[PDB]
Amino acid sequence: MQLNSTEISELIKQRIAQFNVVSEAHNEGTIVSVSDGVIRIHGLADCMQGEMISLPGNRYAIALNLERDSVGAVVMGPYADLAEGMKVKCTGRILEVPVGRGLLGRVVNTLGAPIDGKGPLDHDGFSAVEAIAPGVIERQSVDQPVQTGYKAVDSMIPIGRGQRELIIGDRQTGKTALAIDAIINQRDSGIKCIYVAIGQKASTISNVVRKLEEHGALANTIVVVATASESAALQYLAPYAGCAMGEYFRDRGEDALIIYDDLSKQAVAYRQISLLLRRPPGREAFPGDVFYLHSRLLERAARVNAEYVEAFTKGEVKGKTGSLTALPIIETQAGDVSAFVPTNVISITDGQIFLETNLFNAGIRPAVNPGISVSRVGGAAQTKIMKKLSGGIRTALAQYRELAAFSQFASDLDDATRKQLDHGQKVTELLKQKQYAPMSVAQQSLVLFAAERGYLADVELSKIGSFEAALLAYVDRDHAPLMQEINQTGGYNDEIEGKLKGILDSFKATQSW
C-alpha cells in the first residue's frame, strides 16, 4: 500500500521547487596536515572557534584552535581519505544538531544523521551542542518522582524529575539493564526518553534497540549511537548531542530522561583527543579539564521554573515546569570507587546507585549495595505512600549487612539480633527482582506493606517469590479499584492503611501461595 510512487515522486518534486540557485559567497581554506584524526587548516581567516567546517564528501570537522596562522580541527568521521591540499569551506554555523519531537523512535548518529534505514528526519530546527545550563535563579527544587520498575531503587534510592543519579559498578553487573528498565518504564508516564550509547559494541546496541522495540518503548525514545569503531571525536561529542536533544523538551515545559551509556568511555575518547594535541596530562594521564568535561554536560540535566519556560518559549507555554533527568553510567575497575574519573563524577551528580559484584554473583539482583548508594535529594522525590512505607529501610539493610559480618562467627544479644537477621534477610530475598518485569507503585507499595507489618515472618526464605507472585495475582483479581486509586495518587491515608491490612489478613488466611 504505502509504497505510493506518486508520493515518492512529489516528494522530490517539491525539493526541486524549494531550491535556491542564487550564488552565495563563502570562506575557504586548505588542509595542510592529517594525522590520527586531527586536521590542520591554513586559511579561513573568518573561522570562529567551535565552528563546523565542511569537508569534501558530506563530512564536518570542529574548529578547536585558532592559532595565529592555522586552524586545528578534529574530523567527525572517517578521516583516512582526506589529503593535504583539499579545500574546506567555513560554514557560519557553530556545532549544531537537529532537534524536535520528530526524532522519537529514530536511531541517530551523533551529528543527527539517521543511521537506521528509515529515511530523513522530521525535526524542529537545530540546537547548539555546547550550551551553558540555566542559572541558579532559574532552577526549581526537584519534586516529582521518576519511577523505575525496581523495588530496590524506588524504595531505597528514589529519583526525582530533574535529578542526576550516577549508576556505577564493575563490568557485567547490570548497569545497562537497570538503565533501560527505567527507560522502558516511562512507556506510559509522559516522560520522553533518550539513550546515548558511547563506545558500545554495535551488536549490543542493536540488541538494546530490539528489546526497546519489543516492549513498545522505542516509539518514545531517541537513540544516539557512537560505536567502538567510530572516531574519538564522535564518541567524545555524542553525549552533548543527546543533551541538546533533551533540552528541547526541557525548555518547552515537558519532561525527559536521558541515559549516557558510558561516561568512562567518553572520558577515554577525550583523553585520546587531548593527548594527540600534545596537551600535558594530569592524574592517571587524564587532561586537566576532565572534570569540566563532565561538569558542563551533567549540569544541564535540570528542572526549570515556570518563568524560565515562559520567557524561553516567548509566552506560548504558561505555568508548566520542564525538566531533564540524567542517569550517567560509569564503569569502575575492581570495585574501586576512589579513582580519578569515578570520583569526579560522584562529585557532580545528586547521588549514586552502586552495583556490587559480590552481591551480583551471589544471585542478589539488582545488586544495589546500600550504605554506599544514596539519593542526595532524598525522600522529597517520592510519592507519599512510598515515602511512608519505606522509612529508613535502606539504613536498616545497611546495618543488617555489616551485622552479617560479625555474626558470621558468633553473636551475643542472640535473639534480637536473631530476629533482626531473619527480617533483613527476608527483605533482601524480597528486593531481588527479575529483569524486564517492572511493577507499579501500587504493587511495590503493598509488597513493602507486607514486608514492614511483619506479615512475611511465617513463610520461609524459600517461599518469598511465589508469595509475592500470588499476592500480586490475588489483588489483581479482587481489589483492582484500590490499585487504580493508589496508582492514580500519592495515596496514603488511614483508610488506605485499613484497606491494605484487610487485603493482607485475608490473603494470608484463604489464599494459595
Binding site: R68, I132, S141, G282, Y292, A302, S347, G371, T395
Partner: protein, 458 residues
C-alpha cells in the same frame, strides 16, 4: 583599539599598538556577536601582544575582532547595597531583581593586610557538633577547613555550621559558591529567603556550568565583599563552597598560558596562587572574618599537592573519610586526623584537653589492633585489649550525631549538644561508667542521657 590574534580554548591573545598595551589584570571587552565578553589579561608578551582569559563562553570568537581596553581591573559592587542579592564573578546581578544600588566599587585584586595589622583571638566558638568542638574546637575570627573526598559530608556539615553559627550571629555573612552545583545554590537561596535571613547574607555564585575564568576569579570576588564588611569595623562570616575548584580552574588554564607542568600536572605556581588568596582572608585589629572552607581532596588522596598545600593555611582542619561514612557514622569525621590550633590546656581548660587526648589515645590504640583482629580474630586479645576495643567502638558510635539539615535523609530530628554536655559523656564512656549499655545504644543520639535512655529499647 586592539585585535584578537589567537583563540585557544579559554585564553585569548590580543595585539595592541606598542604605546597602548594594557597592564596586567586590566579588563578588556569584545562584542562576541550579540554579546559582550570581558577578558582579563594575565601576561604581557612581547611586541604589544597580551594574553588574556575570557570571563565567558569563548565559542564564536573570530580572529581579527576588535577589542576595547577598559583601563581598570575587574570591579565589583560592594558594601551594604550588595546584601541579600546574588551576583556574578563580574559583580553583575544574577537574580531577576533590579540593579544593585551600590555606592562604591572595589578591584578584586588586593594586597593582604600587613603583619602589623593582624590580630589573634583565644575566644572559643561553640557549635552543636560533638566531634568538631571536642577534637577540633575553633575560635572566633579564625579559619576552619573541611577536607573530604567526593560525597562524604563536607557540604552538609557546612550547612549545619551555617545553621548553628550564622543565625545566632549578629553581623553580616558572605557565601561564595566556587565551582559547585547550581541546584544547591538555588536550594540555599530559597532556604534563606523562606526563613527571612536573606537580608543578612551576600551571595556570589560561579558554579560548575561556567567556563574556567569565572570559576577562577569568583573566589576573589567574594573575598572582596567580605573585606569591605571587615574594614567597616564589623565582624563577618565567610563561607566558601569548594576552594579546590579555585586551583583546579588554574590548572585547566595553566598549560594554555604556556607554562611548564609541575608534579602531577598542576600549575607551577600552585602554592603562590593559593597563598595570595588565603592570606587576605584573615581577621584584623579593625574587624574580624570567621571562615569555613570546604576542601575537596581528589581520589581520596590526602597527599595530593593541593590538599597538602592547603593544610598549612588553616587553624582547625576537619578531615572526613569515606571508610567512616560507609559505616553510616555521620558526620564522618576522622578523629585521628582532625586537629585544631586551639586545643591547648591554656585555651580550653585542662578537662577538655585531657578528655580529647584520652579519646585520641584509645582510638589510636584501637587502630593498632585492627590487623591482629583481622588475621587471628578477636578471641586472641588479652582480657583488657578486649576492653579497649569495646570502649573504642562505643566512642566511635558516640561521635555520631543527628543534624537538623539531615532530617530529609534519616527522618530523625536534629540534636544540638553543648560542649559541657559532651566532655561529660566522653569522660563517662572512658572511665567505664557505661559498659553495661550495648554499642547501638550510642548510635545517632545527642547527650549521653539519650544513650542510657535508648538502651531501654535495645
Amino acid at each position: 583599539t586592539g585585535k584578537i590574534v589567537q583563540v585557544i580554548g579559554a585564553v585569548v591573545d590580543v595585539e595592541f599598538p606598542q604605546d597602548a598595551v594594557p597592564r596586567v589584570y586590566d579588563a578588556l571587552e569584545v562584542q562576541n556577536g550579540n554579546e559582550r565578553l570581558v577578558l582579563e589579561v594575565q601576561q604581557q608578551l612581547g611586541g604589544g601582544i597580551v594574553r588574556t582569559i575570557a570571563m565567558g563562553s569563548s565559542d564564536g570568537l573570530r580572529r581579527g575582532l576588535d577589542v576595547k581596553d577598559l583601563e581598570h581591573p575587574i570591579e565589583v559592587p560592594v558594601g551594604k547595597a550588595t546584601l541579600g542579592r546574588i551576583m556574578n564573578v563580574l559583580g553583575e546581578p544574577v537574580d531577576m531583581k533590579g540593579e544593585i544600588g551600590e555606592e562604591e566599587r572595589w578591584a578584586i585584586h588586593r594586597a593582604a593586610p600587613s603583619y602589623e595589622e593582624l590580630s589573634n583571638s583565644q575566644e572559643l566558638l561553640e557549635t552543636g557538633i560533638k566531634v568538631i568542638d571536642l577534637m577540633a574546637p575553633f575560635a572566633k575570627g579564625g579559619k576552619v577547613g573541611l577536607f573530604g573526598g567526593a560525597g562524604v559530608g563536607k557540604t552538609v556539615n557546612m550547612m549545619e555550621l551555617i545553621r548553628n553559627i550564622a543565625i545566632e550571629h549578629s553581623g553580616y555573612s558572605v557565601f561564595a559558591g566556587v565551582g559547585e552545583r547550581t541546584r544547591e545554590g538555588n536550594d540555599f537561596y530559597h532556604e534563606m529567603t523562606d526563613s527571612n535571613v536573606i537580608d543578612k547574607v551576600s551571595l556570589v555564585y560561579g558554579q560548575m556550568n561556567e567556563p574556567p575564568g569565572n570559576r577562577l576569579r569568583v573566589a576573589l570576588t567574594g573575598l572582596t565583599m567580605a573585606e569591605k564588611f571587615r574594614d567597616e569595623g564589623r565582624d563577618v562570616l565567610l563561607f566558601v563552597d569548594n576552594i579546590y575548584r579555585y586551583t583546579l580552574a588554574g590548572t585547566e588554564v595553566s598549560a594554555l598560558l604556556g607554562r611548564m607542568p609541575s608534579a602531577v600536572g598542576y600549575q607551577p605556581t600552585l602554592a603562590e596562587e593559593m597563598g595570595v588568596l588565603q592570606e587576605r582572608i584573615t581577621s584584623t585589629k579593625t574587624g574580624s572574618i570567621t571562615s569555613v572552607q570546604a576542601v575537596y581532596v581528589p581520589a581520596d588522596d590526602l597527599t595530593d599537592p593541593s590538599p597538602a598545600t592547603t593544610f598549612a593555611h588553616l587553624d582547625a582542619t576537619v578531615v572526613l573519610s569515606r571508610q567512616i561514612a560507609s559505616l553510616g557514622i555521620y558526620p564522618a569525621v576522622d578523629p585521628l586526623d582532625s586537629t585544631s590550633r586551639q586545643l591547648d590546656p591554656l585555651v580550653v581548660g585542662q578537662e577538655h584537653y585531657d578528655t580529647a587526648r584520652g579519646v585520641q589515645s584509645i582510638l589510636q590504640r584501637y587502630q593498632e589492633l585492627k590487623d591482629i583482629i583481622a588475621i587471628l580474630g578477636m578471641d586472641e586479645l588479652s582480657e583488657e585489649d578486649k576492653l579497649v576495643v569495646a570502649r573504642a567502638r562505643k566512642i566511635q558510635r558516640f561521635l555520631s550525631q543527628p543534624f537538623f539539615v539531615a532530617e530529609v535523609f534519616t527522618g530523625s530530628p536534629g540534636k544540638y549538644v553543648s560542649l559541657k554536655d559532651t566532655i561529660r559523656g566522653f569522660k563517662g564512656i572512658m572511665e567505664g561508667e557505661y559498659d553495661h549499655l550495648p554499642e547501638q545504644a550510642f548510635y545517632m543520639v545527642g547527650s549521653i542521657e539519650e544513650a542510657v535512655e535508648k538502651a531501654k529499647k535495645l
